C-alpha cells in the first residue's frame, strides 16, 4: 500500500474503501427562512448546496451519503428531508439532536479549575496574571448562571460556524457509528468503528472517488490563498471512528480554557498527533497531510459567496 514520512516517522497509507460514507453538514440557525414544507438546506443560485449533495449522491450511487442537519425545523421541513431520503436511496439524513455526545463532554468548571490551579502555582512575578483573571471571570460567570455548563452545552448556545465546527469533529469521532446510532437502515458495507469522509457542501464531486490511501488513514483540506496554505476543516477524511488525531484535538479542547473546534480540535489535534511542532515545517506537514482528489472541485463558495460569512 505504501507509506509516507513526516518528522522521522513513517506512516502507512491506509485505505478508505469506496463504501466509506460521505458526510455533508447543514446546520440552519433560521429555518423559518425556508418554506414550511421545503427542504431546509440552502439551495440558492449562489449556494446550490442541496443540489450539490444530490449530485454527489447520484455519482456515488453505491456509497452511503450522510447529511448531518440541525436547527429548529418545522414538522413539514422534516418530512421534506424524509422525502429526500426516499428519492435517493443512499442519502441518510441524521438529526444532530438524535445523537448522544456526552461521552465527549466535560464541565467548563472543571476545565477552568484545572487551568487556574496550574497558573496559580506559578508565583505572582511570572504568572500570566491577565489570563488567570479571564479564566476566573469565566468560571465565576459559569457558577453564577449555569454551574453545570459543559463544552457541549456551551457550544449549543454559540450559533454559527463555531457550533457546527464543534459538532463536525464530534460526529467524525463517531464515524460510521453515527449512522448506526441514528438507526439508518441499509447502509451498505458500513461497519462499526468504520470511517467517514466529511465534505463541505461546496466541494463538488465530478466522478467517483474510489478508494483513498491516507497517512494513518486521515487527511484534511489544505487551502491555498494568495501564496499561503493552511490546514482546513472543509474536508476531513478518517478511516475509523475515534481517530487518535481527532481524539487529541478533543483532548486539547478539554484542557484549554478557550478551545477552538477548528484551531484546536482539528489543526491542533493533527499537529500534535503527527508531531508537527512549531519548530517543524508547516508547509511540509500540509503537503504530507493534504486531502487530494482530481474528482473534487474544492471550496466553490469562494467563487461566489460564503453561505455564512
Ligand atoms: O448556515 C450554515 C453555513 C454553513 N454551514 C456549513 O459550513 C460549510 C462551509 O460553507 P461555505 O463553504 O459556504 O463557507 P466557507 O467556505 O466560506 O467557510 C457548509 O458546507 C456547511 O456544512 C452550515 O452548516 N450552516
Ligand atoms: C474550504 C474550508 O476549509 N472551509 C471551512 C468551513 O467548512 C468551516 O466551517 C470554516 C470555519 O472554521 O472554516 C473554513 O472556511
Ligand atoms: Mn466554502
Residue numbers in the entry: 27 to 335
Text from the published report:
Three highly related Salmonella effectors, SseK1, SseK2, and SseK3, orthologues of the enteropathogenic and enterohemorrhagic Escherichia coli T3SS effector NleB1 (7), translocate via the T3SS into the host cell. Similarly to NleB1 (9, 10), SseK1 and SseK3 are N-acetylglucosamine (GlcNAc) transferases that modify the TNFR1-associated death domain protein TRADD and inhibit activation of the pro-inflammatory transcription factor NF-κB, as well as necroptotic host cell death. Here we report the structure of the Salmonella arginine N-glycosyltransferase, SseK3, in its apo and ligand-bound forms. The SseK3 catalytic core domain (∼250 residues) shows the classic features of the large glycosyltransferase type-A family of enzymes (GT-A) consisting of a single module composed of a central parallel β-sheet core flanked by a number of α-helices.
The structure of SseK3(14–335) at 2.20 Å in complex with UDP, GlcNAc, and Mn2+ was solved by molecular replacement using the apo-structure. Due to the length of the crystallization process and to the hydrolysis capabilities of SseK3(14–335), in the structure co-crystallized in the presence of UDP-GlcNAc and Mn2+, the ligand is hydrolyzed with the UDP and N-acetyl α-d-glucosamine still present in the active site. A comparison with the apo-structure reveals that the C-terminal amino acids in the ligand-bound SseK3 fold back onto the ligand to produce a short segment of α-helix, with the last two residues Trp-334 and Arg-335 directly interacting with the UDP and GlcNAc. SseK3 contains the classic GT-A DXD motif (226DAD228) that coordinates the divalent manganese cation in an octahedral geometry. Mn2+ interacts with the carboxylate oxygens of Asp-228 and Asp-325, the UDP diphosphate, and the hydroxyl group of Ser-327, as well as an ordered water molecule, which bridges, via hydrogen bonds, the metal atom and the carboxyl group of Asp-226 of the DXD motif. Ser-333, Trp-334, and Arg-335 all interact via hydrogen bonds with the oxygen atoms of the diphosphate. The last residue visible in the structure of SseK3(14–333), serine 332, translates 17 Å from its position in the apo-structure to interact directly with a β-oxygen of the UDP. The N-acetyl α-d-glucosamine in the active site is stabilized by a series of interactions that involve the anomeric C1 hydroxyl group, at a distance of 3.6 Å from the phosphorus atom to which it was bound, and the guanidine group of Arg-335, with hydrophobic interactions also established between the sugar and the aromatic ring of Trp-334. The GlcNAc C4 and C6 hydroxyl groups in the structure of ligand-bound SseK3 are locked in the active site by the side-chain carboxylate of Asp-191, which may explain why UDP-Gal, which has a C4 inverted stereochemistry compared with glucose, shows the lowest affinity for SseK3. Differently from the clostridial toxins, the active site in SseK3 contains a glutamic acid residue, Glu-258, 3.2 Å away from the anomeric carbon.
